[PDB]
Amino acid sequence: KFSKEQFDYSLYLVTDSGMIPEGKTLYGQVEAGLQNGVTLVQIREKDADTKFFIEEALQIKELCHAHNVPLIINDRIDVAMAIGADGIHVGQDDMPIPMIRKLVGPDMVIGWSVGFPEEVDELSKMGPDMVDYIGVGTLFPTLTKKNKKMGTAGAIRVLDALERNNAHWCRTVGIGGLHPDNIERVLYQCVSSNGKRSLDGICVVSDIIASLDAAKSTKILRGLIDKTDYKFVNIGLSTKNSLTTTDEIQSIISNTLKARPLVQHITNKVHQNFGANVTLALGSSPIMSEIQSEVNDLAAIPHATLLLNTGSVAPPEMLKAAIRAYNDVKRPIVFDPVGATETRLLLNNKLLTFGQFSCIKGNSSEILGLAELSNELLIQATKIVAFKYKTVAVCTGEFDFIADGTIEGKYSLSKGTNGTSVEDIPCVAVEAGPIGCSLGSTIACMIGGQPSEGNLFHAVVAGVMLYKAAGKIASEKCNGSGSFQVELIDALYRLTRENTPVTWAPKLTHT
Amino acid sequence: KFSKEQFDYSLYLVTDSGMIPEGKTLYGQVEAGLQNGVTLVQIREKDADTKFFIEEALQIKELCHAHNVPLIINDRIDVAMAIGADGIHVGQDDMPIPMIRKLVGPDMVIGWSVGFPEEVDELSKMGPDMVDYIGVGTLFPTLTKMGTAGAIRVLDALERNNAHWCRTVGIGGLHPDNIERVLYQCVSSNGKRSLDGICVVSDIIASLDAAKSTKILRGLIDKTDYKFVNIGLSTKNSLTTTDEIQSIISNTLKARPLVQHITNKVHQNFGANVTLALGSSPIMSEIQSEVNDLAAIPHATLLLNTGSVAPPEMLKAAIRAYNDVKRPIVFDPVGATETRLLLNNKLLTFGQFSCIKGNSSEILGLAELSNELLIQATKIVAFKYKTVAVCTGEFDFIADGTIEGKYSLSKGTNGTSVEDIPCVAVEAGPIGCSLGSTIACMIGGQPSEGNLFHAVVAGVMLYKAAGKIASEKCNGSGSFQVELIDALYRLTRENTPVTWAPKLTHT
Amino acid sequence: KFSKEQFDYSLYLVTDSGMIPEGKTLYGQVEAGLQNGVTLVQIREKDADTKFFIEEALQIKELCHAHNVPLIINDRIDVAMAIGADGIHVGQDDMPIPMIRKLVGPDMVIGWSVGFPEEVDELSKMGPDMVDYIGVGTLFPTLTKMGTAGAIRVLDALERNNAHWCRTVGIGGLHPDNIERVLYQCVSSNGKRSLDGICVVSDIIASLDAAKSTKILRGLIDKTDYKFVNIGLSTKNSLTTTDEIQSIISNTLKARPLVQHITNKVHQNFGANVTLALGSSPIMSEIQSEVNDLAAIPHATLLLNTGSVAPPEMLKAAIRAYNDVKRPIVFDPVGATETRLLLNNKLLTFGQFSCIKGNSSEILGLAELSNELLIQATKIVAFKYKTVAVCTGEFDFIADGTIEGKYSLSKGTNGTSVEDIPCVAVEAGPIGCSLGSTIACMIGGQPSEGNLFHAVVAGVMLYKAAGKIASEKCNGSGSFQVELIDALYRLTRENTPVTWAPKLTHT
Ligand SMILES: Cc1ncc(C[n+]2csc(CCOP(=O)(O)O)c2C)c(N)n1
């Protein structure tokens, strides 16, 4: 018999009998997992005879208690009472929490499956001793649950309602579609806005239970869960609070010129050509492939980068493949969501759950939207985006605000961030007096050439300066919309062919 | 809150959500049912969200409690404790009973789906306050999720273990077309216990007129007479007199009975002769469609063999057609082997027989086991199937288990056990399915005011009597057979039973 | 490299690659069998790349040449010349025989698939050095790609043509449940020829244990006793004495045999009566599941008619069932027309009969064709189907063709031909399925030490004697029939054969 505060939600294993690899037992699997982590166990029988249920449940509570880890049951309250369970997990369509508590009395843990912030509101109007831990939504598509309606974005919305309502007593785990190919990302971008709360643990089912080798699969998840660095891009992620110096900007450009980045553009037909020209100017080769099979070979090429629009004709099933393919080799993705309308809203949020981006670029509307909402306003909104999607965010306008919410690639369980909140991540401005997707292309090239020892922040900033600089130079040499565009590409070339950033007009202050 | 002894098991309604006619509600049906009986209610949700379960079970608990009838839950104990239910019913593959008792404490009614005697044994090894009532087996084929004989074996285990505390209900396929029969033969062998109640589902829930279906079952449930055959069933203990035997034969001769023979090929011919001899007409139809029209003809009678070639589906048909027009069926299970055991035990659950006729071996098999021994088995068969049971041999024993056609809930029989039903004997000194045909004809010609038992005995005399005559006038197996038919013809054509050789004593 | 004469056709294995149980190799089986018999191997690939074929016919020619056993290829000649094979087997739809003998030249073995006599004619007018051996038709239904009668016709042509250079193996559905019967009744009509060996497979290759399967098949082949009926099979040339006929009748009254009749409607009734008279119990089952249960009962006997309405699949069930337990079967083909001719020949390949009964017509067809004529046919039938055979007329002829249940490879009998089996006659002057029932009862009664032949005769005498007696005490067709049954009753209730009118002489 344990006590609420003894429950280690680190690596929470949930079982499913009908999914076991031929030649193995539910016990065998659930065992090899206790020898390598699986620090908590839920028994799940959605179909078996409520007797065979009790038999298998008793059989596993001996193995469990043996390794000193609790057993939880789902979602049969009676079976829990019957066999001396340590806790029960119930869903939103199962017996109400108040009724359960009256039958079981305080001291027994209660899980509740929560997917929306509106459900955290009810969990709170019940006070402590009611709910003890929630399993958050269904983060990713899974083939385990056979029947209602997520991503990290959705889980943030819930961790945030756990704070607004100050439900200190209630822990959290993330569950569903969780595998080694996205655990770090999930752990990494699942923090409350104020940086105070994160997931206390991770849930798996088809990852150990369905495994031809549960011993290894469990040891692997352990590896990731209590690591603390998500090095998602092969650049430096160090937090730099010092403004970007002329010497820094100059060395960024020599690298991007000397390493001829290959920048794959997945974007609309109107930027296709233009964007290719900005790339050619910046001394790098552009490829416009939306071909799924190619994607992994393309991203294999040295110093490759992915710049990425919405409204592209490519099927989401290819974006998901491309995005992943770049993250697997740890190369930079520059995201730019042009949206706004109901369809694009959906598409953009689906994309944001496919992987981890090194930069998210947008204008006023697209940024205020992404933050889930002046000048003091844009700044606060750029920082929210930056933090939320753990990325360098750029907000374009008369002023350009950059913000670094990468936080050196740190995650931890529950902690959650090191007191580092939305409000105080580095954010800098760039302006050059009154005067599109071409920036994305520029940003893309600067990050692209950076070496192991580079820095992702100074890169994204150098880019904004280079562009705003060509921006000022063109607007003076031009005759109208037509020639402005071709003198912009001209300026971008001359400027980076002579690395004299001590010359360019944009002024770089603190925001 | 009720007490265990406040539970009325009469008409016990189990609910099913996905079976209600379009335009109607689970509240709707279960309301009209309470108004005309439905003296107990179980909610059953094998599929629904365990919340909508709670919701829908609170809403029906107000309805039930208002007509003052309990509410039982199958088979989630949690849902039961949760909503303060009155009882819970659990099946064999559900939560062990000791565990349930431990979570609900004594005072809650527990139900246990029992279909085999061996499980009544575990129910007793637990003592009272454990299992409080049981649902017996699956009596008949049903499409929502043994026979009456399979239930009796249970009601018998409840007696040998003296588990007085345990009530019973019958369940599975129960409808107006067999309720009265279930009730009528579902009694313990010592006659002291019967079913406390009848349990339905598809019969009220799935009714386009719930109100009306409930009023019909109540109709049958608390009546007490199964007039299953248009003949008198009075219990006569006065040996059949010579004037009685006489009158029987006059009636069978004056109404020219029509006897349907569903038998093998070997008896076909010989059986029709014996019928003809008796002044009546045989029909050897084994055609399903014809069956209703046939049995509607005046004084129709069905004689029935096993090992006939006709399919079970049609035998089911026939037996039914004849019990519907309240006419007499005479059963004769020749068998013994695995196939014939299975086939007969299926036929015996298709309807009610007016007389089962076997020889020594057949009789011991049916009775589920000398001369004192034959007598016991012949009673056992007679009481077990509530019928007149004949047993052939040097001595023929006739036993009357019709008990005037009386049933009742839990009573069960007026204490009238296997041991004390009328059993007589017939014998005519040392000397088959022809007996079937004789008996058949005799019962056939009986008028509303007649008597079944006396008629079956008349048959066994007449036959035994024509027997001695033949054996005296024959040159061998060959001519014995024609003369047996002749003597039957000469005997019935002169009603002087005071002349006949066979002596009829008590057993 | 072998010679034509070093070919041991005893156990002839024929591979099939796609039928080996998961976990086993064609090498593993073909090896496993070599160590327990498998005295000649053929390689059969009707589907694989003619390369892989080649590799596998080499790998397996080592394994074979090592156990000193040849290797035959079918039906690709090239592959046989190519890997230095010992012989080629070709069918009817394959390369003509002349062409082959030119490309491979003498000293190599050529086996032909023959299944009709005509094909033996072709095979004769080609002389020796052409066809060496021949696999005979398909004997029984098989799933891998006539009966033992079809085989006989072929083994006859091989003699009428005098193809002394030609061996024979039987093939097609050969399994433990039917190998001895095949080995036993598959001899020449002149008794000088029989099968030189037996072709599997799907019995060794398909086997979950190829070693055991091959040991068994060995057991059967070089044994020389087919005990198919648990009764004496001794040849007796001593006319059946009065004492024996009397003993015969006591044994059968005392043992009350159970005679299962499978027959039409018109012999049902009459049939049971005769059996009854003979003091034995008749069963009229045509029920498939009961059939194994029935034949387990003591002293059981199967009387089989044609034109019964029973499905062929069931008669197969039954005929096997009685052979499995070694109890007697009496066959009575009533036909004559295309459909009946078929059905009959088909039953005569389901199992081993103890007696075949027919009249002039029926007995003539079964022989495949006066008073000298009816004797030669009765002998032919008796010998062909290895059984006691009975031709009914004014004279009745009985012929013991069982030869003591003796079989041996190629030999094949012990010079006992169709012309010289014991055949006796029975007559009583000028005067059906009844005689079937009578015989079935007299054989049924016999104990381990009895004699099939004497019993068959006993029956014919009894039935004949009861004939003369009835013909006298009767007034017509009707009274004759009943009187006949009576006389059977009387005659057997007093075993005084010395009294009977029927005269028993040699034929
Ligand atoms: C602690 C807890 N939270 C939520 C639920 C409901 N739930 C959401 S998705 C899913 C399947 C995950 O398997 P996989 O890892 O194969 O995607 C489960 C069972 C629960 N039963 N327990």
Ligand SMILES: Cc1ncc(C[n+]2csc(CCOP(=O)(O)O)c2C)c(N)n1
């Ligand atoms: C009290 C009790 N005894 C047994 C059972 C199990 N069971 C046996 S038959 C069947 C279907 C009845 O509807 P129908 O009239 O269509 O046969 C049911 C539900 C139970 N749940 N409750």
Ligand SMILES: Cc1ncc(C[n+]2csc(CCOP(=O)(O)O)c2C)c(N)n1
């Ligand atoms: C010697 C010889 N005779 C005939 C043939 C043709 N053939 C007739 S039956 C059959 C398969 C029977 O196996 P089973 O019935 O045991 O499955 C085959 C292979 C041949 N290839 N060689």
Ligand SMILES: [Mg+2]
């Ligand atoms: Mg649930």
Ligand SMILES: [Mg+2]
């Ligand atoms: Mg149940």
Ligand SMILES: [Mg+2]
């Ligand atoms: Mg061929």
